[PDB]
Design brief:
Elements lengths: L16 H13 L5 H10 L4 H14 L9
Helix pairs in contact: 2-3
Length: 71
């Protein structure tokens, strides 16, 4: 697969759970959610796509030093 998209601005307020949940999937899948995964995140959590997307973007932006392939 391969895809990307910019997303400026940032502002969210997740109690924790929801966040944590999707968070688990992130550490499971990685950092490449599909329109389907997002849909599930927007459902399971009941959050908007933009929200999930945005939030994620943050994770990506951060991740830089550490990449794929452990080590």
């Amino acid at each position: 697969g391969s895809s990307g998209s910019s997303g400026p601005r940032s502002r969210t307020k997740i109690s924790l759970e929801a966040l944590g949940i999707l968070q688990s999937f992130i550490h499971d899948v990685g950092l490449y959610p599909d329109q389907e995964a997002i849909h599930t995140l927007s459902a399971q959590l009941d959050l908007p796509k933009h929200t999930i997307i945005k939030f994620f973007q943050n994770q990506r932006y951060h991740v830089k030093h550490s990449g794929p392939s452990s080590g």
